[PDB]
């Protein structure tokens, strides 16, 4: 009942420092490739004093 496969490229994971190096490596080896852009978290506005606002909805009910 083990998991059998016939794909030699099943565990092939390659690491590249930048996107263009990976693109050039894929294009050099004749592999049709797709590229997904890097998703970064946008900066937030953090305030500890917003938990105790006088008239805003951002008051905390407890702590």
């Amino acid at each position: 009942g083990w998991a059998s496969t016939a794909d030699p490229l099943s565990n092939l994971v390659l690491t590249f420092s930048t996107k263009e190096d990976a693109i050039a490596f894929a294009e050099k080896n004749g592999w049709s490739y797709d590229v997904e852009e890097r998703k970064v978290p946008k900066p937030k506005s953090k305030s500890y004093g917003a938990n105790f606002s006088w008239n805003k909805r951002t008051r905390v009910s407890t702590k």
Partner: protein, 430 residues
């Protein structure tokens, strides 16, 4: 002036401390209270702040912060939000019972202090947070507030000065951590009494998010006397940056445990031998003194001989003035059991919000229980010292420091006694 103490009765701010005179408005008005208050309310906020900061009055809560700067932090134009003066009448520190006397016997002095302080920083109202256990004191304060309201001293057009001011009383529900100013602010708002993080300071965001100044009962009740008698009169007592008088509660193994007002730079030996009638068994029977309640490190007999009960000299004795609560233990006292009971009190009274106090104070409680039994080794003594150093300075509020300090004092001054205890347990139980 080098020697301090032996205060005359004419220089005492807190007359009728013992309750031998009338505590109501008629008796208080004959003792100088509510006198010429319209003049102080009409002389402006900045004049009151200057009179306060010329006297050099420091905060009587225990931190010892200067009062003039702290009160002038709210001397700014308002941005549509009201401003609040909040009086800390919790007094949960063991050994400290002065604020109970001030509330129970001189309530009108507290109300006049609330009005003068609120005029000094433009407060819309006043919220007095009394201890939940002080039901009779709270009812006395409510009676006095009703008498002041009915006489026109507070409320609409307070004292005929055109200033509008209300005084409210909020009763607690039995939590020592609610004595902390930010935890007090959170408890007034109907939440759990857990302290906030600073910044924001209460002058920026306080109760209901409004600007707020939290002040002790003792540092509020003296303010009308400061504005009336003058700042130089208050500064004439005590040393530099230790000006004025102070209420001391002497308790423990002493002949006459009592609350008494005295000059700020009084010697501890003179204070004990004069006002409290000396310790039991004479001065040679003294073993240790905790000078500022349970939040301060203790000092042995060899330090209390030549020490002065102000902020600076007690700081230089690697302890603190605290709330000026002198707890005295003689030679018939297990010091380890006393400090263990203190740590047990701190474990029971801990809000548990932030990690180091919540875990470490229970850890210290278990370690000191084994120390009392003697089931340990000196490596655990050094480990407890390191744990106490790890708790202190890494917490949200100052209860963690107040639980770390007594163990550090006990270790530093009585390591041989602890070591003898564990070695006699090891040689008896094996």
């Amino acid at each position: 002036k080098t020697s301090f103490g032996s205060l005359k009765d004419e220089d005492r701010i807190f007359t009728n401390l013992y309750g031998r005179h009338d505590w109501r408005l008629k008796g208080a008005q004959s003792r100088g209270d509510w006198y010429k208050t319209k003049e102080i309310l009409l002389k402006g906020p900045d004049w009151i702040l200057g009179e306060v900061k010329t006297s050099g009055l420091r905060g009587r809560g225990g931190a010892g912060f200067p009062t003039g700067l702290k009160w002038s932090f709210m001397n700014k134009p308002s941005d549509g939000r009201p401003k609040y003066l909040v009086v800390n009448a919790d007094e949960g520190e063991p050994g400290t019972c002065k604020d109970r006397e001030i509330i129970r016997h001189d309530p009108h002095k507290l109300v006049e202090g609330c009005l003068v302080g609120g005029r000094a920083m433009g407060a819309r109202a006043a919220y007095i947070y009394i201890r939940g256990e002080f039901y009779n004191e709270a009812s006395n304060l409510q009676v006095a507030i009703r008498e002041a309201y009915e006489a026109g001293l507070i409320g609409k057009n307070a004292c005929g000065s055109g200033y509008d001011f209300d005084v409210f009383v909020v009763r607690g529900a039995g939590a020592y951590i609610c004595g902390e100013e930010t935890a007090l602010i959170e408890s007034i708002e109907g939440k759990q009494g857990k302290p906030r993080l600073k910044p924001p300071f209460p002058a920026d965001v306080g109760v209901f998010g409004c600007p707020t100044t939290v002040a002790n009962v003792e540092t509020v009740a003296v303010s009308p006397t400061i504005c009336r008698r003058g700042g130089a009169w208050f500064a004439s007592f005590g040393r530099e940056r230790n000006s004025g008088t102070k209420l001391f509660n002497i308790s423990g193994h002493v002949n006459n445990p009592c609350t008494v007002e005295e000059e700020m730079s009084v010697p501890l030996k003179e204070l004990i031998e004069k006002h409290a009638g000396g310790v039991t068994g004479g001065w040679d029977n003294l073993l240790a003194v905790i000078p500022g309640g349970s939040s301060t490190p203790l000092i042995p007999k060899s330090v209390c001989e030549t020490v002065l009960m102000d902020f600076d000299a007690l700081i230089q004795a690697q302890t603190g003035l605290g709330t000026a609560a002198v707890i005295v233990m003689d030679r018939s006292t297990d010091i380890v059991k006393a400090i263990a009971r203190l740590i047990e009190f701190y474990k029971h009274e801990s809000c548990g919000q932030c990690t180091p106090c919540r875990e470490g104070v229970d850890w210290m409680n278990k370690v000191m229980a084994r120390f009392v039994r003697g089931d340990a080794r000196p490596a655990e003594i050094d480990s407890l010292w390191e744990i106490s150093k790890q708790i202190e300075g890494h917490t949200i509020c100052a209860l963690g420091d107040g639980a770390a300090w007594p163990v550090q004092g006990l270790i530093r001054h009585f390591r041989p006694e602890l070591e003898e205890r564990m070695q006699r347990f090891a040689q008896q139980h094996q």
